[PDB]
Amino acid sequence: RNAFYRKLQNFLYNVLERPRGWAFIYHAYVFLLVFSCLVLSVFSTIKEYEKSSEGALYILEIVTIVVFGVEYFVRIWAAGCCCRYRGWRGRLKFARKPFCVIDIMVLIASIAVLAAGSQGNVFATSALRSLRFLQILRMIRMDRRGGTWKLLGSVVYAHSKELVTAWYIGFLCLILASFLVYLAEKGENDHFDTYADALWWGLITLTTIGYGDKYPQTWNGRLLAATFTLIGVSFFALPAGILGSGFALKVQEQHRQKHFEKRRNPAAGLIQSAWRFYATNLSRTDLHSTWQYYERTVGLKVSIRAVCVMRFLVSKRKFKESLRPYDVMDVIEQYSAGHLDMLSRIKSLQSRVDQIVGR
């Protein structure tokens, strides 16, 4: 009973919290489901299609709210598989997580909208904006880890100075070109009736949009727009290329490092050292295993404690160093160490067959 119970618990936790293979399918389905809902809500906002789409929208709304509630309950139950959250207080702490609170606020907001806004199925006008915002936040919540946001932030920080330079130059050219076009076509063109119209046009231009609502018509304004467009469209599109290139480089490095064996071995060393530490506790009247083992390898008790903790902390440090493997630093450090070892060898042979030459 308990074996299958815990098997199901861990399987559900893996599917919901850390999906790798088939679990994603389910997630995708939910996303599609949620996606469909907005689409139906989308199709319900139009009057000519509201009468034809509102029933399906309401049915899908009941389905999605039920699915979200059951998923939340299953997740807060499967949180018992990991020992961080077990028991009443453990499940409470799991619920304390920001995305869990986001989920419950989503559920209660959906309930409130369905109760008040839907005197029937179709929804109230005021509740419509709240419903759309709720769907937006559900889409935000679709990913629980926020790994996308973390990755984007890390990549941006890696290029913080440099994105900053791109943005600063882009803004400067936008302001300056807008100012001159406003000067040149203040009265001749009604499009640039005001400086603000010039700023809007310059933003539309430097972004490669080209709405056509505003555009220079004079020779001088057109010339200046041409020059500063050539100058600044590249700057405005630069952050996209910056990020794309940097993203590809990051994934390339991650692929390069993947091997991770020199990370494996120090893990074994460190875990053995940690078990020695726990087994050599002086205050514990147990753990005779490591005690007698050391007694084979030999004030005394405290000295053994001290040496064991020295080696455990240094092994922790060593595992920390192996925590980040880089091919370049790997080769550099390995070659430095090997060169030092080789130096020791040659000093040995020199002094040593010097002793021989003496004889």
Partner: protein, 143 residues
Amino acid sequence: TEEQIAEFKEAFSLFDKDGDGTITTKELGTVMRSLGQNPTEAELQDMINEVDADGNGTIDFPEFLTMMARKMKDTDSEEEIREAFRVFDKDGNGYISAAELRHVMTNLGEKLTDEEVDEMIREADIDGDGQVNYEEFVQMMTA
């Protein structure tokens, strides 16, 4: 209490064979090398600086006491343990079979006897299944 300080003083005296008052790299190598564990001098000397608060190249009694008070709870070893059992979890289930513990203990790191891994399975295998969870054991550290 004064009892622990006296024990640390006795430990330092058993370490300060030369009586310098600051156990030096060669001396701390000698003290444990005689016992039966003979690590290469490189590991000892490069470890000394990691704990040498004053950076004198040795360990003085204050540096002895500060770490003697420092237990597993400090040094945020929790993350290191998490990574350590996550690397050896080829499935990611959060649990590892006991036989894999036997093998990894025997054939990696500072190798220990079947007795050490026996007490390991005693402590970790609380529910007696073999597929011991990492989170419970790491909680036992602070506990």
